[PDB]
Write a sequence for this structure.
């Protein structure tokens, strides 16, 4: 009666997801169906296990507690953090991201490094009161901050010329440079590397191990490379 055996014996995998993250897990507002990277991962897992999926909705503020309370067997992707790992189990990670700077292309050679952006002659846009803004103060302590109030977005300041650069996740940046092809990522590496993984209960260790082995097998078979590419996701190495 391991959680693994429970899933297998009942024919049912319960998956917690927020359904609000393009392209990882999106609930289509019309069809009610889920789609996205994580959904594909889960549908592959369930297929391989011979079980059906029950999607359990959750929100960002509650997705951790839903694991800990046993509302679902596994979550879709979330950032692995130490404080979460105190209360929830994580699978192996299959996507790595970090924080990167965006500038206008016209300014890419001028602002080719993190150091170039930490200067009293540089303006960094941020969103007031966010953790991202605290990070900007850490990375660019000499720079002027153009701190805009939500829901104004940092990157719009850069597009407008009211700031020289902003910072965001590589994930979001990779979307942004497609949507706004006047933007570029500063090619000087990523800060604060972080990992996406699935949560499982800390009490469901065999299930954790099962999923870890499955992920390793899917890495080797090229399944995750396929999916990454399908969603234009560029995992850091």
């Amino acid at each position: 009666e391991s959680k693994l055996d429970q899933i297998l014996s009942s024919g049912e995998l319960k998956v917690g997801t927020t359904g609000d993250w393009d392209p990882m897990a999106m609930k289509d507002p019309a069809t009610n169906k889920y789609k996205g990277f994580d959904i594909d991962v889960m549908q592959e897992l369930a297929k391989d296990m011979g079980v059906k999926i029950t999607f359990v909705p959750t929100e960002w503020k509650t997705i951790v507690s839903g694991i800990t309370a046993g509302r679902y067997d596994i979550s879709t992707s979330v950032t692995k953090t130490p404080k979460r790992a105190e209360v929830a189990g994580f699978t192996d990670s299959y996507y790595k991201y970090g924080t990167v700077p965006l500038v206008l292309k016209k300014n890419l050679k001028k602002y080719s490094t993190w150091k170039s952006l930490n200067n009293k002659d540089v303006t960094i846009a941020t969103t007031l009161g966010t953790s991202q803004e605290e990070k900007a103060k850490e990375f660019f302590p000499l720079s002027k901050l153009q701190s805009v109030e939500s829901p104004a977005r940092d990157f719009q300041e850069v597009l407008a010329g009211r700031a020289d650069g902003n910072i965001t996740s590589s994930t979001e940046a990779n979307k942004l440079v497609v949507k706004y092809p006047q933007l570029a990522i500063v090619p000087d590496g990523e800060k604060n590397p972080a990992f996406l993984a699935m949560m499982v209960s800390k009490n469901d260790q065999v299930w954790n191990d099962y999923v870890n082995e499955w992920i390793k097998s899917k890495k080797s078979s090229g399944f995750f490379n396929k999916l990454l590419a399908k969603y234009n996701l560029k995992s850091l190495l």
